[PDB]
Symmetry: C3
Subunit: 183 residues, 3 copies
Amino acid sequence: TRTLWTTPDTSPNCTIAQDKDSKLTLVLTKCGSQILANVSLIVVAGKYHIINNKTNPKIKSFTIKLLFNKNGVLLDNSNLGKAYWNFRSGNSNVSTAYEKAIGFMPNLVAYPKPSNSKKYARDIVYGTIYLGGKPDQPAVIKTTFNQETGCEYSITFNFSWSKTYENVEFETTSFTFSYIAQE
Amino acid sequence: TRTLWTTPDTSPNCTIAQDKDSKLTLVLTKCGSQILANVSLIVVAGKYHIINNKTNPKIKSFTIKLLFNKNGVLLDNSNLGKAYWNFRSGNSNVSTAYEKAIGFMPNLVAYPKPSNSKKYARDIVYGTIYLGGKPDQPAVIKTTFNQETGCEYSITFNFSWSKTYENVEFETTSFTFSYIAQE
Amino acid sequence: DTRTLWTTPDTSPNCTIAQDKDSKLTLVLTKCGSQILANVSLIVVAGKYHIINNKTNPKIKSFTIKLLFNKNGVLLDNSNLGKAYWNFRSGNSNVSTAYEKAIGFMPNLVAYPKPSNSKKYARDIVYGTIYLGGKPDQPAVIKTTFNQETGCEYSITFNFSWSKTYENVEFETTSFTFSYIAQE
Ligand SMILES: [Zn+2]
Ligand SMILES: [Zn+2]
Ligand SMILES: [Zn+2]
């Protein structure tokens, strides 16, 4: 009841360019007023599985979105599958889909939805991870809170890189960050 | 309660160069022997609001200080105002000023005040944040524990940058870190 | 549950990198349910890695500290870290008995598998950057890896490396925080 997660195995659960082309591992732990998060990505097939910027010069980034409703439940237009997201039960998930998780949503006062007033950057956290664990293959992970339309809350992970990679598999090291909770 | 904060709104609470020229958003959450911290800065007026180093080549850094007494109560000569620094209640604060928060202070044995004993670097944490959320606009945030004089405990944030920015507004992305607690 | 397992915050040598007790590893693990919040720093006080000079010794560029654990989450004598002051917390010191069980502090074996011939994925690694002497122009990379050592049930390995050419620099670092998925 204190941890929402994807389960840490290697089974594809996410759709970037084609159905089930990747495995997003994401763990959210409630430490009262802040949520502690840990994330990593493995692309298993399709367009982003093996990066070759000599063959495809413009393939330099992609986005994974998690959209939630007023009760903190995952919406189906998210890249991550609904069957794969729930409160932790041992090393798996609970049997039935959860009904409420408002205490895990990014705080709307710290991070407001888009509008006409001035937009601040505190709703963004930047980090860097490394492809295949290699020190010379960095890629940036930019995480933004509550900026998508069609939902009450959102968490989006944008992955991007500036080097010209030649035949590199897109599977990453892990990164931790935290954010202020709604309740 | 488990959380000491500045509240998540954006009304000025801090004085860097002139009265209430900025909003420091700082959340301290107690997870046992460690404190989980989340910080961000928005400057709204004065000398550090808009940076132009072609015009003022020497404005390259500034500091924000938090000084506390033996009970963990904030001293009035801190750059952060005493008005809204308090334990959390919803998206605001408890009605009455707290009188004890020793469990939130940086540990004096891990981070000792200046003496003639050898000074170690472990009382420092470095992080990089981005102005306006732009990937090409980094600034470094250096956090130091218990090195100020005239107080039993202290937390100081130093912000600096090496690039020659032209009309860049100082408002940052968020950074998360942690430190060992006194009790 | 919400306990702290640590090395104590003093500065008394407690770890062996190149010679006996040449360093002080300060490591604090706190349990927050299913994740462990970690905080680490290092002070080397003697030996080969105490004062770095890559003008006279260009090849001295990295070193490794390993913490090996058995099935109950107890530290094994062959770790670089000494068993004497690695224990649960009490005030600014430790409880009076060497611990029993700490499986709730061990890195998750499904998330981070032991070596085998199955594909090895990079998620069992966390990279961080720290600074020597607190100086902004002296970085070093700290690479942390989970469960990749043999001869144990679990492990946490810290590899320290640097690419700058240092000249007579003392290896004592700022602190870094990371987290990992707990076994239970
Ligand atoms: Zn393949
Ligand atoms: Zn402005
Ligand atoms: Zn020394």
